[PDB]
UniProtKB/Swiss-Prot annotation, chain A:
Gene: MCP
Source taxonomy: Viruses, Duplodnaviria, Heunggongvirae, Peploviricota, Herviviricetes
Complex and partners: Homomultimer. Makes the hexons and eleven out of twelve pentons. Interacts with triplex proteins 1/TRX1 and 2/TRX2; adjacent capsomers are linked together in groups of three by triplexes, heterotrimeric complexes composed of one molecule of TRX1 and two molecules of TRX2. Interacts with scaffold protein; this interaction allows efficient MCP transport to the host nucleus. Interacts with capsid vertex component 2/CVC2. Interacts with the small capsomere-interacting protein/SCP.
Family (UniProt): Belongs to the herpesviridae major capsid protein family.
Organism for this UniProt entry: Epstein-Barr virus (strain B95-8)
Name of this protein: Major capsid protein
Protein's job: Self-assembles to form an icosahedral capsid with a T=16 symmetry, about 200 nm in diameter, and consisting of 150 hexons and 12 pentons (total of 162 capsomers). Hexons form the edges and faces of the capsid and are each composed of six MCP molecules. In contrast, one penton is found at each of the 12 vertices. Eleven of the pentons are MCP pentamers, while the last vertex is occupied by the portal complex.
Domain of life: Viruses
Residues of the full protein shown: 1037 to 1086 of 1381
Annotated localization: Virion; Host nucleus
Curated annotation (Swiss-Prot), chain B:
Subcellular location: Virion; Host nucleus
Domain of life (superkingdom): Viruses
Protein name: Triplex capsid protein 2
Molecular function terms, GO-annotated: structural molecule activity
Quaternary data: Interacts with TRX1 and major capisd protein/MCP.
Family statement drawn from the similarity comment of this UniProt entry: Belongs to the herpesviridae TRX2 protein family.
UniProt keyword Cell membrane, yes or no: no
GO cellular component: host cell nucleus; viral capsid
UniProtKB keywords: Capsid protein, Host nucleus, Virion
Alphabetized InterPro entries for the sequence: Herpes_capsid_2 (IPR002690)
Curated annotation (Swiss-Prot), chain C:
Protein name: Triplex capsid protein 1
Organism from which the protein derives: Epstein-Barr virus (strain B95-8) (HHV-4)
GO molecular function: DNA binding
UniProt cross-references to InterPro entries, sorted A to Z: Herpes_1
Record keywords: Capsid protein, Host nucleus, Virion
Family label: Belongs to the herpesviridae TRX1 protein family.
Localisation: Virion; Host nucleus
Protein function: Structural component of the T=16 icosahedral capsid. The capsid is composed of pentamers and hexamers of major capsid protein/MCP, which are linked together by heterotrimers called triplexes. These triplexes are formed by a single molecule of triplex protein 1/TRX1 and two copies of triplex protein 2/TRX2. Additionally, TRX1 is required for efficient transport of TRX2 to the nucleus, which is the site of capsid assembly.
GO cellular component, one term: host cell nucleus
Summary of subunit composition and partner proteins: Interacts with TRX2, MCP and capsid vertex component 2/CVC2.
Superkingdom per UniProt: Viruses
Gene Ontology process terms (BP): viral capsid assembly
Length: 50, 290, 319
């Protein structure tokens, strides 16, 4: 427990779970909504996956 | 059945990267998942083949057999679409690969990690800061020649004849391929299993066929016999001193043909494509997964 | 050439791969025409037959879609050689009998396949509880000791896929099994069928290693040759056959040197460390939900692979 001939500066990172607040102004972004088209992916032998 | 995987890029895409990707339309690309939409990470062979100096081809094979396969048909800015290759469907796969291997009529295609360089089959995407590389698709005999040339350079590395091994030769052109130095534990494990197979071959191999070829070299000269240079090997001399017996030979061949099928399946790494009716004027082939 | 347009109108339109829905609440007739698959069983009237469309050639069409109809293997077995308390979805194994004309075949569940390995030397409690006497099974294989001794037991047993129909006859049982295709039960209330493999004989190989998740995770059955008699293990993997023989050699790496150390292979035929065979594919996500199989007395753990596509293959030797 003697001191060595050198020192150290211990850096670490600490994660903090926050509860954010998002503001956004009116008419900031114009967006086009598409069409919800349905499909068939896989005809597995007992269940078909849409 | 609907096979359409749209891959949304998380950023934009410049016109040079668009024009480079648009030349590679119809080339086979692997995917991470099999779902509807995907992000750009996991696409291509680039996640296992990093931008380094050291490759590892057998790990890319273990990736390629694990992941699915898709064909690149539409590329746009911010999103490019792919068409999956599920077994049971029949696809039109165009020959849009720059080292031009001419395809056989109703032969068999075979996907492949990029043996002719990283920079050769790739697109640099600085915009999404990743790299999409394209797996090579070449016919199955030339694929076997490339695979055995890689393994032969892996075993001859502690010996040295280089350019006689480090360059594939096809009737269209002969091509150089990238030669690494060590495949790590996976290529050595493949060589381990093939060493088991080869050593058990030289256990159970018959002796009457050596007695055939020893007199046959002394009898006949052939292109199957010119590589011995009219010198029977000494192992033929020190094995053919015994007699010949047909019962132990039929006992030996019943394990020889039993093991050679599994040795044939020790070269089926990477998924295989069974093709049909390849037209040499449109460079596309009606092909499906085998 | 105007009848040609009528023929091509009868031939053109595939089932819709895409359909623009607006809401799910309306449930239009177009999306019903998308989601409907023609059945396989209907009542015995002209209206029900014409409505289900069984009489359409090749595939069902009322008066191609990526679906393949299954094929059924029809097997006649002795009522003693099989247990009628078996589950439906259990994979069986026809043994090629050595007579020129038989009529009656010989199939084996992996429970029944266990007691051919046990005698001469949990799971075994349930196995001996189901079949009382091994000697009524150990004569179906006439020369079991020689065939195990010269390591030719893999080429005489071929897999057959899971069972679907088992009529409860008294002397000569007829069972139906799906040797290829979508495994689905032939019951008048069409209910699903789960391939059941007992738990101690089914060791996973994905979690045995412990990112690209594929869809079709195959199921490999594996005969190996041990000094304690041969063993029938089952392996689930999401990889290729090229991958599966390498990783199964790595998995059996202690057992090969075990069999070598206790017994020197004095002849040339004892080198083969059995073989493997792909039994078919299933979905890698909801695969292998664990369940239980209850007899009257006891209960063993058993895996339940659901929605299996049976596809057997030839034997690839392990060494």
């Amino acid at each position: 427990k003697i001191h060595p001939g050198v020192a150290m500066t211990v850096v670490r990172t600490d994660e903090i779970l926050s509860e954010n607040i998002l503001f956004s102004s009116r008419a900031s972004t114009s967006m086009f909504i598409g069409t919800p088209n349905v499909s068939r992916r896989e005809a597995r032998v007992d269940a078909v996956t849409f | 059945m609907d096979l359409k995987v749209v891959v949304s890029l998380s950023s934009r895409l410049y016109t040079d990267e668009i024009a480079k990707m648009q030349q590679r339309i119809g080339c086979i690309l692997p995917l991470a998942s099999t779902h509807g939409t995907q992000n750009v990470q996991g696409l291509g062979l680039g996640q296992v083949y990093s931008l380094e100096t050291v490759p590892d081809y057998v790990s890319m094979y273990n990736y390629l057999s694990d992941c699915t396969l898709a064909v690149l048909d539409e590329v746009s800015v911010d999103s490019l679409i792919l068409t999956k290759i599920v077994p049971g469907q029949t696809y039109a796969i165009k020959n849009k690969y720059q080292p031009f291997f001419q395809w056989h009529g109703t032969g068999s295609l075979s996907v492949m990690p990029p043996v002719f360089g990283r920079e050769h089959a790739t697109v640099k995407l600085e915009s999404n800061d990743v790299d999409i590389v394209f797996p090579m698709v070449l016919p199955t005999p030339i694929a076997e020649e490339v695979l055995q040339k890689i393994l032969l350079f892996n075993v001859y590395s502690r010996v040295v004849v280089h350019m006689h091994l480090g360059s594939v030769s096809y009737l269209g052109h002969h091509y150089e391929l990238a030669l690494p130095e060590v495949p790590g534990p996976l290529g050595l494990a493949l060589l381990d299993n093939l060493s088991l197979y080869f050593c058990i071959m030289v256990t159970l191999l018959p002796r009457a066929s050596m007695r055939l070829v020893r007199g046959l070299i002394r009898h006949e000269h052939h292109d199957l016999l010119n590589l011995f240079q009219e010198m029977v090997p000494d192992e033929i001399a020190r094995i053919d001193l015994d007699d010949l017996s047909v019962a132990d030979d039929l006992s030996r061949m019943r394990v020889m043909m039993t093991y050679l099928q599994s040795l044939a399946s020790l070269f089926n790494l990477g998924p295989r494509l069974a093709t049909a009716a390849y037209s040499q004027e449109t460079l596309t082939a009606t092909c499906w997964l085998r | 050439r105007r009848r040609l347009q009528r023929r091509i109108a009868g031939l053109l339109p595939p089932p819709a791969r895409r359909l623009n829905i607006s809401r799910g609440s309306e449930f239009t007739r177009d999306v019903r025409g998308l989601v409907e698959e023609h059945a396989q069983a209907s009542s015995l009237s002209a209206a029900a037959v014409w409505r289900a469309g069984l009489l359409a050639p090749g595939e069902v069409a009322v008066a191609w879609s990526g679906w393949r109809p299954p094929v059924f293997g029809d097997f006649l077995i002795h009522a003693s050689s099989f247990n009628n308390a078996e589950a439906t979805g259990t994979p069986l194994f026809q043994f090629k009998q050595s007579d020129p004309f038989s009529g009656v075949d010989a199939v084996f569940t992996p429970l029944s396949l266990f007691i051919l390995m046990n005698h001469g030397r949990g799971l075994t409690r349930m196995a001996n509880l189901l079949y009382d006497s091994p000697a009524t099974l150990a004569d179906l294989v006439p020369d079991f000791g020689r065939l195990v001794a010269d390591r030719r037991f893999h080429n005489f047993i071929t897999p057959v896929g899971p069972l679907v129909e088992n009529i409860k006859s008294t002397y000569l049982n007829k069972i139906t099994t799906v040797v290829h295709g979508p495994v689905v039960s032939k019951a008048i209330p069409r209910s699903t069928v789960k391939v059941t493999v007992p738990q101690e004989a089914f060791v996973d190989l994905d979690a045995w290693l412990s990112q690209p998740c594929p869809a079709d995770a195959r199921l490999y059955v594996a005969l190996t040759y041990e000094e304690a008699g041969p063993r029938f293990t089952f392996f689930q993997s999401s990889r290729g056959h090229c991958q599966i023989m390498n990783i199964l050699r790595i998995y059996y790496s202690p057992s090969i040197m075990h069999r070598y150390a206790v017994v020197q292979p004095l002849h040339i035929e004892e080198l083969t460390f059995g073989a493997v065979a792909c039994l078919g594919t299933f979905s890698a996500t909801d695969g292998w939900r664990r369940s239980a199989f209850n007899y009257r007395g006891s209960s063993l753990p058993v895996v339940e692979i659901d929605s299996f596509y049976s596809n057997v293959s030839d034997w690839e030797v392990i060494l």
